[PDB]
Nucleic acid binder design. Structure first.
Ligand code: MG
Ligand code: MG
Ligand code: MG
Ligand code: MG
Ligand code: MG
Ligand code: MG
Lengths: 83, 83, 81, 79, 82, 79
DNA sequence: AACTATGAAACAAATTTTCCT
DNA sequence: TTAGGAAAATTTGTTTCATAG
DNA sequence: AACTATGAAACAAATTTTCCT
DNA sequence: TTAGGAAAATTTGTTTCATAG
């Protein structure tokens, strides 16, 4: 098994960008990771922690609260900075 | 953390070829893996199983019993076949 | 062509492979339970497994004759295991 | 009991010229797996029937309970 | 060159940060124990950590002037952490 | 209480011009870590001494046990 | 080809915040 | 009104990776 | 650029074998 | 001499990866 050659930030952005409304709940993001790569079908304690850490740490990922909870979105302009 | 871009057989051969007498016990091979790459400092249940599996499966790795137990060696001619 | 297996050949196998060369009905049932469970696989599964075994085990050698390709068994390399 | 290796050997071993193409091995496995699928729900009664029908299977009653044995001479007479 | 810390400023910090602005001697000791344990780090450790924090937190802005580059604190940006 | 951020901020805030080069921050941390290393075995007695020496620290005896408080007015004079 | 130095990423954790029994 | 638990977030400090010199 | 087919590798496990309490 | 335990080996069958076509 090989981990994808992309950063967590890039992968998370990919997940969100591929969604129909450009937004995903945390659990939906986890699902995208496990469905897409074999690497994420094990050691969940490690990679899910990485995902949450990246979502909070990086300003390009903005939590948008809504009636049923909250979804994560991507501030593309922000994502582009430093990259 | 990234796993080395080499097969288990290639890494095992490397460990043995670097030893002073071209022989290593199983525990010494585990130690070479952990000392050499961060990747092998976690999920021991998985990679140690991989190492034992590779040692038995591939004919290029020959167990040589000795007074103190047994060491693993490499049949270079064999390793070269299929490669 | 003779069937690969029959209840008779299977019952004989169960008994012959046993310790005392004897089995109670319940023991024969246990053996059959395990055996039928093993075969409850699909073509996609066994087909993959067959190719895997032919290219992994040395006892299986492919002899190319005036037909295309045929696999044979090296009994001497088969016994060692 | 069975492994793909023993099965592949059985197929090849039980064929004249002791050879088989990959397609022929596939055919043998198809027949074999079909057999077990077809009889997955009948083997219990089939076994009881065979035990009492064929003389090669002899019931030996010992201390506690009874056991079944094979009369190899009788068995080898069927073929 | 007044010291960055003195027992006096530390004792006051422990008491001021407390719930009811008052601590027993033992509570002050517990605070000091934790504090001294935090600082038991080597130069290789804190040096790395300092560079890490300067380039991670936006409240720390490098204002490049005349010669060399000096940092500074964005009191407002630091407000979030407050 | 303390994080590298609060410390870096403390250093810069206590400096003139409220600015510091990376080397100056390094100097401040060197002095700071040196302080805690130097006094790792003396702080218990040092704390007891300071509490009874400085009037800004007042011992208030309530129901069970006694607690220490800071007389903010007194503390500020000396600064 | 080695080796060092170093920021971005990755990691491992300790805490916090919310929503529910 | 608290007490806990699980998710979800937020934070901190350390280790690893990729590479410019 | 996509997609399929497929052998090598990688995985996950069930068992075995040895050496010691 | 039987009963585990753990490390070391051996085995089997399934999933993943890289890539020819
Ligand atoms: Mg964010
Ligand atoms: Mg071997
Ligand atoms: Mg082979
Ligand atoms: Mg009969
Ligand atoms: Mg920053
Ligand atoms: Mg006093």
């Amino acid at each position: 098994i090989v981990r994808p050659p992309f950063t967590y930030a890039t992968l998370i952005r990919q997940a969100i960008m591929e969604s129909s409304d450009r937004q995903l709940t945390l659990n939906e993001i986890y699902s995208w990771f496990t469905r897409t790569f074999a690497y994420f079908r094990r050691n969940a304690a490690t990679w899910k922690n990485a995902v949450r850490h990246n979502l909070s740490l990086h300003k390009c990922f903005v939590r948008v609260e809504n009636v049923k909870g909250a979804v994560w979105t991507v501030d593309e302009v922000e994502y582009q900075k430093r990259r």
